[PDB]
Scaffold this active site. Structure first.
Site, PDB file in Angstrom:
ATOM      1  CG  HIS C 199      -2.102  -1.011   0.816  1.00  0.00           C
ATOM      2  ND1 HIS C 199      -3.031  -1.220   1.882  1.00  0.00           N
ATOM      3  CD2 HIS C 199      -2.356  -1.758  -0.251  1.00  0.00           C
ATOM      4  CE1 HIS C 199      -3.949  -2.279   1.436  1.00  0.00           C
ATOM      5  NE2 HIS C 199      -3.391  -2.458   0.187  1.00  0.00           N
ATOM      6  CB  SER C 203      -1.776  -2.168  -7.770  1.00  0.00           C
ATOM      7  OG  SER C 203      -2.212  -3.311  -6.706  1.00  0.00           O
ATOM      8  CE  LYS C 225     -11.211  -6.809 -13.293  1.00  0.00           C
ATOM      9  NZ  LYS C 225     -10.170  -6.442 -14.382  1.00  0.00           N
ATOM     10  CG  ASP C 226     -10.497  -8.679  -5.925  1.00  0.00           C
ATOM     11  OD1 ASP C 226      -9.873  -8.744  -7.173  1.00  0.00           O
ATOM     12  OD2 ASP C 226      -9.796  -8.330  -4.974  1.00  0.00           O
ATOM     13  CD  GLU C 269      -0.497 -34.200  -3.877  1.00  0.00           C
ATOM     14  OE1 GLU C 269      -1.065 -33.190  -4.711  1.00  0.00           O
ATOM     15  OE2 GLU C 269      -0.950 -35.181  -3.565  1.00  0.00           O
TER      16      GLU C 269
HETATM   17  C1  HEM Z   1       0.229 -15.987   1.491  1.00  0.00           C
HETATM   18  C2  HEM Z   1       0.862 -15.774   0.096  1.00  0.00           C
HETATM   19  C3  HEM Z   1       0.515 -14.508  -0.665  1.00  0.00           C
HETATM   20  C4  HEM Z   1      -0.444 -13.567  -0.430  1.00  0.00           C
HETATM   21  C5  HEM Z   1      -1.495 -13.938   0.805  1.00  0.00           C
HETATM   22  C6  HEM Z   1      -0.601 -12.413  -1.208  1.00  0.00           C
HETATM   23  C7  HEM Z   1      -1.517 -11.505  -1.187  1.00  0.00           C
HETATM   24  C8  HEM Z   1      -1.312 -10.310  -2.154  1.00  0.00           C
HETATM   25  C9  HEM Z   1      -2.319  -9.282  -2.333  1.00  0.00           C
HETATM   26  C10 HEM Z   1      -3.715  -9.335  -1.880  1.00  0.00           C
HETATM   27  C11 HEM Z   1      -1.751  -8.364  -3.470  1.00  0.00           C
HETATM   28  C12 HEM Z   1      -2.745  -7.307  -4.011  1.00  0.00           C
HETATM   29  C13 HEM Z   1      -2.777  -7.186  -5.546  1.00  0.00           C
HETATM   30  C14 HEM Z   1      -2.680  -8.396  -6.373  1.00  0.00           C
HETATM   31  O1  HEM Z   1      -3.722  -9.218  -6.249  1.00  0.00           O
HETATM   32  O2  HEM Z   1      -1.710  -8.453  -7.010  1.00  0.00           O
HETATM   33  C15 HEM Z   1      -0.550  -9.043  -3.921  1.00  0.00           C
HETATM   34  C16 HEM Z   1       0.459  -8.056  -4.698  1.00  0.00           C
HETATM   35  C17 HEM Z   1       1.804  -8.569  -4.598  1.00  0.00           C
HETATM   36  N1  HEM Z   1       2.354  -9.592  -4.161  1.00  0.00           N
HETATM   37 FE1  HEM Z   1       1.543 -11.117  -2.888  1.00  0.00          FE
HETATM   38  N2  HEM Z   1       0.582 -12.654  -2.114  1.00  0.00           N
HETATM   39  C18 HEM Z   1       1.098 -13.884  -1.431  1.00  0.00           C
HETATM   40  C19 HEM Z   1       2.594 -14.633  -2.180  1.00  0.00           C
HETATM   41  C20 HEM Z   1       3.433 -13.673  -2.828  1.00  0.00           C
HETATM   42  C21 HEM Z   1       4.721 -13.961  -3.479  1.00  0.00           C
HETATM   43  C22 HEM Z   1       4.915 -15.791  -3.100  1.00  0.00           C
HETATM   44  C23 HEM Z   1       5.142 -13.074  -3.892  1.00  0.00           C
HETATM   45  C24 HEM Z   1       6.497 -13.071  -4.277  1.00  0.00           C
HETATM   46  C25 HEM Z   1       7.731 -14.182  -4.032  1.00  0.00           C
HETATM   47  C26 HEM Z   1       4.429 -11.892  -3.520  1.00  0.00           C
HETATM   48  C27 HEM Z   1       4.899 -10.481  -4.120  1.00  0.00           C
HETATM   49  C28 HEM Z   1       3.834  -9.661  -4.275  1.00  0.00           C
HETATM   50  C29 HEM Z   1       4.133  -8.520  -4.957  1.00  0.00           C
HETATM   51  C30 HEM Z   1       5.570  -8.350  -5.815  1.00  0.00           C
HETATM   52  C31 HEM Z   1       2.913  -7.967  -5.200  1.00  0.00           C
HETATM   53  C32 HEM Z   1       2.948  -6.408  -6.334  1.00  0.00           C
HETATM   54  C33 HEM Z   1       1.513  -6.338  -7.077  1.00  0.00           C
HETATM   55  C34 HEM Z   1       1.857  -5.988  -8.423  1.00  0.00           C
HETATM   56  O3  HEM Z   1       2.694  -5.761  -9.092  1.00  0.00           O
HETATM   57  O4  HEM Z   1       0.969  -6.036  -9.406  1.00  0.00           O
HETATM   58  N3  HEM Z   1       3.324 -12.118  -2.915  1.00  0.00           N
HETATM   59  N4  HEM Z   1      -0.079  -9.951  -2.970  1.00  0.00           N
HETATM   60  C1  LIG Z   2       2.988 -32.555  -0.544  1.00  0.00           C
HETATM   61  C2  LIG Z   2       4.432 -32.755  -0.258  1.00  0.00           C
HETATM   62  C3  LIG Z   2       5.250 -31.674  -0.365  1.00  0.00           C
HETATM   63  C4  LIG Z   2       4.748 -30.320   0.006  1.00  0.00           C
HETATM   64  C5  LIG Z   2       5.364 -29.402   0.260  1.00  0.00           C
HETATM   65  C6  LIG Z   2       6.588 -29.232  -0.383  1.00  0.00           C
HETATM   66  O1  LIG Z   2       7.409 -28.107  -0.564  1.00  0.00           O
HETATM   67  C7  LIG Z   2       8.018 -27.567  -1.401  1.00  0.00           C
HETATM   68  C8  LIG Z   2       7.218 -27.410  -2.751  1.00  0.00           C
HETATM   69  C9  LIG Z   2       7.888 -26.815  -3.988  1.00  0.00           C
HETATM   70  C10 LIG Z   2       9.210 -26.406  -3.781  1.00  0.00           C
HETATM   71  C11 LIG Z   2      10.094 -26.436  -2.566  1.00  0.00           C
HETATM   72  C12 LIG Z   2       9.366 -27.268  -1.519  1.00  0.00           C
HETATM   73  C13 LIG Z   2       7.244 -30.406  -1.093  1.00  0.00           C
HETATM   74  C14 LIG Z   2       6.512 -31.646  -1.019  1.00  0.00           C
HETATM   75  O2  LIG Z   2       4.760 -33.591   0.959  1.00  0.00           O
HETATM   76  C15 LIG Z   2       5.089 -34.894   0.785  1.00  0.00           C
HETATM   77  O3  LIG Z   2       5.513 -35.713   1.541  1.00  0.00           O
HETATM   78  N1  LIG Z   2       5.290 -35.068  -0.727  1.00  0.00           N
HETATM   79  N2  LIG Z   2       5.761 -36.329  -1.333  1.00  0.00           N
HETATM   80  C16 LIG Z   2       7.061 -36.487  -1.520  1.00  0.00           C
HETATM   81  C17 LIG Z   2       7.142 -37.282  -2.518  1.00  0.00           C
HETATM   82  C18 LIG Z   2       8.599 -38.062  -2.910  1.00  0.00           C
HETATM   83  C19 LIG Z   2       9.526 -37.112  -2.651  1.00  0.00           C
HETATM   84  C20 LIG Z   2       9.378 -36.199  -1.656  1.00  0.00           C
HETATM   85  C21 LIG Z   2       8.171 -35.747  -1.298  1.00  0.00           C
HETATM   86  C22 LIG Z   2       4.908 -34.183  -1.257  1.00  0.00           C
HETATM   87  O4  LIG Z   2       4.782 -33.773  -2.734  1.00  0.00           O
END
Ligand code: HEM
Ligand SMILES: C[C@@]1(c2ccc(Oc3ccccc3)cc2)OC(=O)N(Nc2ccccc2)C1=O
Ligand code: HEM
Lengths: 89, 109, 377, 53, 47
Positions: C199, C203, C225-226, C269
């Site tokens: 914020h 965005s 939209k959401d 998985e």
């Molecule tokens: C619990 C996991 C996550 C939640 C709950 C979450 C929630 C959100 C929300 C509500 C927004 C607002 C607008 C949109 O929808 O883009 C957003 C934007 C963003 N989030 Fe996340 N997100 C999560 C995982 C991530 C991850 C894994 C990354 C990157 C490793 C990330 C980086 C960003 C960035 C960079 C934005 C920028 C918005 C844009 O540039 O358009 N977030 N996120």
């Molecule tokens: C669901 C799962 C799992 C969950 C989260 C993980 O976390 C990562 C996901 C992506 C990249 C790195 C970690 C990885 C495996 O948990 C689990 O027991 N497995 N099974 C599994 C089978 C063979 C080798 C290793 C694992 C998953 O896939």
């Protein structure tokens, strides 16, 4: 109501405003409409009349918006449009 | 320290002009400088533009953002033509980079 | 009356009602709110499953079946949970992809928090999957846990520590239940911090160009939209729950416990496939796990490798091609991670692994530099 | 001291909102009834006799 | 192995039937509200 009575009468003060009123009333109403008739119209208005008459023209009605200047904060139209009705009503 | 023209330079130009068309910001009416990433050097360059340029860029960007939301583009007749594309921000930006680089060289001694 | 003054609704208003947002954000931007919905989804169903699951080695597998057969509608709740975990990853993936393509990672803090949110949910899903004490749950638990054993000098005291014994047993199933219950609450806090940092700038958008000249209120627009997009997340979730409950679910977790017998071909998985292939590629214990960690930990190097004078890839034909080659490469890793470690597959799997890193660490940044030159910047 | 709200205007205010407050109860009743499937209340609506006897 | 099998697909039916009602409707709600932006027109009029 009183504000309208004072305004009506305060306005028609002097030849020019009265002339303009005779002249244009005949254009619009066709007749003159004497002070007294206006008075009776005004008297008839009470809360109910205000509520109904306002509702009719205002309630849940699409407005026309015009804006000029530093208007970034002027509300979006949807937002203005939603202000024309009340969710508690 | 001058003379040359080359069929090759035209090929280079042709490759640039090709990429410019491929980049596509000209379909949104944008101009190259309108698409630059605003970092600090850039924000300051924007800040130094004269009113006319400052305002033109604002309207162009709005026009593009609005196109983007409709996922539309301008009629081909209105795309910004490579080579009619004005480097309006460049000289301000170059100058703001020069002064920063000067500050940096002073901070070294 | 007012949303703006009340110490509480003021937060709501500033986050969901009056927040200025780009007039042009795309469907790709829907995933963040879908990730929030996912988390809440996991939380509710997760919880009701906890009112009936038991964490002991003996009755674990059994209690889950108690839920699917005996407890009213447990089956629907159990499947929503499982399929919700998959959706959550589907969303992480799109969300992280959207950030890469569009340059959103340039918001340093919020992107860095995202990575943490990524690792936290992966940690969470792992512990989760072990819970029913099925064959894959057990062996998957065994594989992943043993990664830590590669760490030099302290490797084994650590796995045994995390085990609470000499192998994945009793102690581990119970602690995994515990950590798996608290993690999503901790995730929730990190997400609010994620939203706070975001914020600060608002965005980004498809063009990578500032939208301050064309902001619209989050409320009527992104609110609807959401909503629409939530319903789409729901359809896709139900389709699975109600037509394909076992589709992503491995058949071997439908068979209890075998610390004595490892299944012939253990398969991750789904969302771990690509990372599993990378770990496997390289025939080395240490180097595999190092490659594995780097495969995810790389997201935080991404911002240092931005090289282009533009933010988004919208006007960048070269980077676009390389981006999809990245996606296509991940899809290859996925296919390969779900396959036996043999002839055609190990070589394909090693070349895809160098490609992933080759394109992030070198190809993308070089495309950016030539796109700049091509433009005379 | 609640006598601040005791006067003609407040009585007219109370009146103008009666229909609204009435209709809100209508909504709340029907809504509570229908969400719990009020056996008692519902058994009396002509259709919605999806409990045979 | 799967006692719920028959209830699930009856629900499943209802899910597509309901989704087929709600999807078009919610979509139409969003277009309505977005109308204002989609058809808005711009004009630049500098001095
Ligand atoms: C619990 C996991 C996550 C939640 C709950 C979450 C929630 C959100 C929300 C509500 C927004 C607002 C607008 C949109 O929808 O883009 C957003 C934007 C963003 N989030 Fe996340 N997100 C999560 C995982 C991530 C991850 C894994 C990354 C990157 C490793 C990330 C980086 C960003 C960035 C960079 C934005 C920028 C918005 C844009 O540039 O358009 N977030 N996120
Ligand atoms: C669901 C799962 C799992 C969950 C989260 C993980 O976390 C990562 C996901 C992506 C990249 C790195 C970690 C990885 C495996 O948990 C689990 O027991 N497995 N099974 C599994 C089978 C063979 C080798 C290793 C694992 C998953 O896939
Ligand atoms: C509110 C916090 C959570 C609680 C209380 C919770 C509770 C549970 C319980 C009791 C189980 C075992 C019963 C079963 O297997 O069906 C389980 C399994 C699982 N949960 Fe959670 N969980 C929570 C958050 C999460 C999160 C964040 C995820 C990741 C999206 C997640 C994905 C999983 C997965 C994959 C399993 C294994 C599912 C299976 O195939 O059986 N849950 N959870």
């Amino acid at each position: 109501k009183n504000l309208l009575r004072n305004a009506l009468v305060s306005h028609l003060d002097g030849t020019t405003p009265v002339c303009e009123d005779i002249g244009r009333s005949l254009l619009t109403y066709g007749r003159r409409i004497p002070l007294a008739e206006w008075e009776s119209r005004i008297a008839e208005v009470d809360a109910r009349v205000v509520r109904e008459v306002c509702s009719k023209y205002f309630y849940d009605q699409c407005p026309a918006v015009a804006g000029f200047g530093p208007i970034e904060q002027l509300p979006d139209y949807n937002r203005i449009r939603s202000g024309m009705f009340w969710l508690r009503f | 320290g001058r003379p040359a023209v080359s069929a090759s330079s035209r090929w280079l130009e042709g490759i640039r002009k090709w990429y410019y068309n491929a980049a596509g910001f000209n379909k949104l009416g944008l101009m190259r400088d309108d698409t630059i990433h605003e970092n600090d050097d850039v924000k300051e360059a924007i800040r130094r533009l004269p009113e006319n340029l400052y305002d033109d860029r604002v309207f162009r960007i709005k026009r593009a953002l609005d196109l983007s939301m409709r996922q539309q583009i301008l009629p081909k007749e209105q795309w910004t033509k490579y080579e009619e594309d004005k480097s309006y921000l460049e000289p301000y930006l170059k100058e703001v980079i020069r002064e920063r680089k000067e500050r940096e060289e002073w901070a070294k001694k | 009356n007012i949303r703006k003054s009340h110490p509480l609704m003021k937060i709501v208003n500033n986050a969901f009602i009056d927040l200025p947002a780009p007039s042009n954000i795309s469907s790709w931007w829907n995933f963040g709110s879908l990730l929030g919905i996912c988390l809440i989804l996991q939380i509710l169903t997760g919880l009701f499953l906890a009112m009936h699951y038991t964490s002991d080695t003996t009755t674990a597998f059994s209690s889950v079946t108690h839920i699917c057969r005996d407890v009213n509608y447990g089956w629907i709740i159990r499947y929503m949970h499982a399929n919700g975990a998959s959706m959550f990853f589907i969303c992480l993936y799109m969300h992280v992809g959207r950030g890469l393509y569009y340059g959103s990672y340039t918001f340093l803090e919020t992107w860095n928090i995202g990575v943490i949110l990524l690792l936290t949910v992966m940690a969470t899903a792992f512990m989760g999957y072990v819970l029913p004490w099925g064959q894959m749950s057990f062996w998957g638990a065994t594989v992943i846990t043993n990664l830590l054993s590669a760490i030099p000098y302290i490797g084994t005291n650590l796995v045994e520590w995390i085990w609470g014994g000499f192998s994945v047993d009793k102690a581990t199933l119970t602690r995994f239940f515990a950590f798996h219950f608290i993690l999503p609450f901790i995730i929730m806090a990190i997400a609010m911090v994620h939203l706070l940092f975001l914020h600060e700038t608002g965005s980004n958008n498809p063009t990578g160009i500032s939208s301050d000249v064309d902001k619209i209120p989050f409320h009527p627009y992104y609110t609807i939209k959401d909503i629409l997009g939530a319903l789409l997340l729901i359809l896709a979730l139900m389709l699975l729950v109600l037509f394909a409950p076992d589709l992503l679910g491995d058949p071997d977790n439908y068979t209890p416990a075998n610390p004595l017998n490892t299944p012939p071909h253990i398969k991750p998985e789904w969302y771990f496939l690509f990372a599993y292939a990378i770990l496997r590629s390289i025939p080395n214990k240490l180097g595999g796990v190092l490659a594995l960690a780097f495969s995810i930990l790389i997201l935080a190097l991404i911002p240092l490798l931005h090289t282009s004078k533009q933010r988004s890839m919208m006007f960048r034909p070269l980077s676009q091609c390389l981006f999809w080659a990245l996606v296509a490469d991940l899809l290859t890793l996925t296919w390969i991670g779900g396959q036996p470690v043999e002839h055609p597959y190990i070589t394909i799997g090693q070349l895809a692994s160098v490609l992933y890193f080759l394109l992030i660490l070198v190809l993308m940044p070089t495309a950016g530099t030539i796109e700049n030159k091509l433009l005379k910047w | 001291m609640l006598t601040r709200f005791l006067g003609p205007r407040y009585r007219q205010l109370a009146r103008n909102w009666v229909p609204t407050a009435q209709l809100w109860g209508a909504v709340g009743a029907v809504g509570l009834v229908w969400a719990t499937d009020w056996r008692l209340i519902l058994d009396w609506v002509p259709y919605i006799n999806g409990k045979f006897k | 192995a799967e006692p719920e099998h028959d209830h699930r697909k009856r629900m499943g039916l209802k899910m597509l039937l309901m989704m087929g009602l709600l999807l078009p409707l919610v979509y139409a709600m969003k277009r309505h509200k977005w109308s204002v932006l989609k058809s808005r027109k711009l004009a630049y009029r500098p001095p």
